[PDB]
Amino acid sequence: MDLVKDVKRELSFSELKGKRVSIDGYNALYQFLAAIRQPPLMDSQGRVTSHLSGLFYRTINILEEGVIPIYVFDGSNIMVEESKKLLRAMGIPIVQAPSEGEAEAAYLNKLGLSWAAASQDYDAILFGAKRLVRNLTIYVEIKPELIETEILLKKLGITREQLIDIGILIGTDYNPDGIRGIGPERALKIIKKYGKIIDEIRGLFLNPQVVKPEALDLNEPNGEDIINILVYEHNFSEERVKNGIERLTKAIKEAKGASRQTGLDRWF
Amino acid sequence: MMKAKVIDAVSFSYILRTVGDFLSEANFIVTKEGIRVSGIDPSRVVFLDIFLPSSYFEGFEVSQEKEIIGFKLEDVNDILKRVLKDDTLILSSNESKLTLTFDGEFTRSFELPLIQVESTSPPSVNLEFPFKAQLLTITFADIIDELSDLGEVLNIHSKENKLYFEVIGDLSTAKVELSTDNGTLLEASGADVSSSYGMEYVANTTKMRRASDSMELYFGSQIPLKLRFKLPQEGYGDFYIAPR
Amino acid sequence: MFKIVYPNAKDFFSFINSITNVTDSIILNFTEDGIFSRHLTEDKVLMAIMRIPKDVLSEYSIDSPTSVKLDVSSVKKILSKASKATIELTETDSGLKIIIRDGAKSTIYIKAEKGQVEQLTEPKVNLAVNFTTDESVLNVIAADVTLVGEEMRISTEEDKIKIEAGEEGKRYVAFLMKDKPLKELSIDTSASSSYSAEMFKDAVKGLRGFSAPTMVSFGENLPMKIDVEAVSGGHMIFWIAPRL
Ligand SMILES: [Mg+2]
Ligand SMILES: [Mg+2]
Ligand SMILES: [Mg+2]
Ligand SMILES: [Mg+2]
Ligand SMILES: [Zn+2]
Ligand SMILES: [Zn+2]
Ligand SMILES: [Zn+2]
Ligand SMILES: [Zn+2]
């Protein structure tokens, strides 16, 4: 565990309909690389095409539900680039982060340009994300999961500065494994009593390198660029795409529509 | 610019609904003499020639010598599927749009952008058939809609002025006798062809029942099956089907 | 404990079936003022409200306003499993009993969790435009719009109501006016508003089962309220949130 200091509620796609979501590019890709395997999914030339299968099949699944997806990349690097070239060709908005993708994903949410950051990891919270949605990328039916920072901080009775310090005691990427022999629960207790007495690591979370985007809108998906990186170079089956690329653009009509939708609760 | 008002909009609907079983795209070729819709299907087995005279319409005008209105059939058919019982359809067209308006309890019109579609017709007929038969469209639609289950191929023939509709299915072949001494045929002449046809092609013309009271049937050995569904006010819906 | 009597069981079932178009799990509220039911979809786009004022009921006997959550699907599916008659609600230890007296008589027992009476939180806004018409008119338009696009645009146009839909060059236009077909029309100010075509269809679809007319009301970039008063006195309402 890295964060199990959570009581969080699941959310139906109903509540998520008509919402821009700051999906982490890198996190999404690994998930797609680690999940779907038909016979890693290979092609004719003998390379992994599993990243593309996710970006194609799951993103339509997302758009058909009403979620406007924004993939955020930071910086094989060619796998990432040919993931971007697909997303440009699909029309789905793309944002290049100055350093940390999830920090940018948090910042887009913080600017009100996204409703929430989406990742399987919790790092977005520590970068100032208002909300974190899990399980978009991936009895036990896996439903979307929502963590609200405002509700989290109130229930644990801490501030954002404090959660960062707890993150330090648990372990971030800047301090992998954190302080040994202190877990989440012990970290929470410690900071709830004091305030940490790495002095730079705080600054990497509080105020990291992020950009105002300058975008972020759904464009028309053209096939003359989609087929080139899917059906040929990385060898996909066009038979599936014909009925799939067709529902892609068809999903945009309902997705961009839902974006304009007002809530009946602004007249209560 | 073209304007044509159709009183029996539901009937009109069934004409175009048939064409849609054969064609995905067609032209309304509107002239001072009337409105023509024709074309060949992708498999090249069926050519259809449907003419609706100016008198078929309740008030009809065309500003030019000829006007070509290109439309996707399923789009027009879906619109036409929204017709009400008491409604009257009015077709108009301008520089860019084809408009279909239903007028009844209230007015509601649908617009579709003009489409470019190849008017190749033809290319089929210089034909004289050895056998011709007149019958009510209703009874034709009974025989075919109840025979359409069995067989990919409808093999019909004539003998002693009597017209026999045979289909060879999985277990046994069932045949239907149509004659004037029977009650199903009105008039018939000629001798003595035996041909077979693609069952799906014939069965797809049966909705013309809802648009035509009587019809003519022309056939011959080695030559096309011509169905001429007589339409109101001297109109006609021609369907040539190539032989198997 | 309670006793409620409604003079018309036909309309009672209609209310239940109407809310079912939204939640399939109804929750009635027995207040001092009467009965109501209010479900708000998880997207907060659409809201169904049933309200039957106390004076409209044959008998209304309570002492304490309570809530009754009908045992989700199963129970609300046992109700609509029943069919001119009166209907009676009475309290059981673990739910409620229903008597349908027609001089026939039937009783279906329902297990239902009881609780604290809820609020009737409803959009607080002024709609400058409203009109009355049949349900059939509303159904026609609803089917017409969803056929053409995802979005509907209702607006005032001189002494007419103009309904529009259309995605890419292919549009739909409908005109509604006094006597054609509107029963009554009131335009306080010019108003234009866009709504999800599907959402309009769902709301309209949930208003069949009443011979009574239907009031539709909107404003400039405001929610649309559509309601029917049942012949016996109740009120079924649908609110639809606009697009901006
Ligand atoms: Mg990261
Ligand atoms: Mg470790
Ligand atoms: Mg004559
Ligand atoms: Mg409810
Ligand atoms: Zn992870
Ligand atoms: Zn002979
Ligand atoms: Zn619906
Ligand atoms: Zn009232």
UniProtKB/Swiss-Prot annotation, chain A:
Residues 260-268 are annotated as: Interaction with PCNA. Its cofactor is Mg(2+). The lineage of its organism: Archaea, Thermoproteota, Thermoprotei, Sulfolobales, Sulfolobaceae. The keyword Nuclease applies. This is Flap endonuclease 1. Disulfide bonds: none annotated. Mg(2+) 2 binds at residues 121, 123, 173. GO terms for molecular function: 5'-3' exonuclease activity; 5'-flap endonuclease activity; DNA binding; magnesium ion binding. GO terms for biological process: DNA repair; DNA replication, removal of RNA primer.
Curated annotation (Swiss-Prot), chain B:
SUPFAM superfamilies: DNA clamp. Keywords: DNA replication, DNA-binding. The keyword DNA-binding applies. Transmembrane segments: none annotated. The keyword Oxidoreductase does not apply. InterPro entries: DNA_clamp_sf, Pr_cel_nuc_antig, Pr_cel_nuc_antig_C, Pr_cel_nuc_antig_CS, Pr_cel_nuc_antig_N. One of its GO terms (biological process) is leading strand elongation. Belongs to the PCNA family. One of the sliding clamp subunits that acts as a moving platform for DNA processing. Responsible for tethering the catalytic subunit of DNA polymerase to DNA during high-speed replication. Heterotrimer stimulates the Holliday junction resolvase Hjc. DNA polymerase I, DNA ligase and the flap endonuclease may be constitutively associated with the PCNA heterotrimer forming a scanning complex able to couple DNA synthesis and Okazaki fragment maturation. Forms homodimers with PCNA1, which then recruit PCNA3; does not form homotrimers. The heterodimers interact with RfcS homotetramers. Heterotrimer which circularizes head-to-tail (head is at N-terminus, tail is at C-terminus) to form a toroid; DNA passes through its center. Replication factor C (RFC) is required to load the toroid on the DNA. This subunit interacts with DNA polymerase I (dpo1). The heterotrimer also interacts with flap endonuclease 1, DNA ligase and XPF via the other subunits. This is DNA polymerase sliding clamp 2. It comes from Saccharolobus solfataricus (strain ATCC 35092 / DSM 1617 / JCM 11322 / P2).
UniProtKB/Swiss-Prot annotation, chain C:
GO terms for biological process: leading strand elongation; regulation of DNA replication. The keyword Oxidoreductase does not apply. Gene3D superfamilies: 3.70.10.10. The keyword Manganese does not apply. One of its GO terms (molecular function) is DNA binding. Keywords: DNA replication, DNA-binding. Forms heterodimers with PCNA2, which then recruit PCNA3; does not form homotrimers. The heterodimers interact with RfcS homotetramers. Heterotrimer which circularizes head-to-tail (head is at N-terminus, tail is at C-terminus) to form a toroid; DNA passes through its center. Replication factor C (RFC) is required to load the toroid on the DNA. Heterotrimer interacts, probably via this subunit, with flap endonuclease 1 (fen), Hjc, Dpo4, and XPF. One of the sliding clamp subunits that acts as a moving platform for DNA processing. Responsible for tethering the catalytic subunit of DNA polymerase to DNA during high-speed replication. Heterotrimer stimulates the Holliday junction resolvase Hjc. DNA polymerase I, DNA ligase and the flap endonuclease may be constitutively associated with the PCNA heterotrimer forming a scanning complex able to couple DNA synthesis and Okazaki fragment maturation. Belongs to the PCNA family. This is DNA polymerase sliding clamp 1. The lineage of its organism: Archaea, Thermoproteota, Thermoprotei, Sulfolobales, Sulfolobaceae.
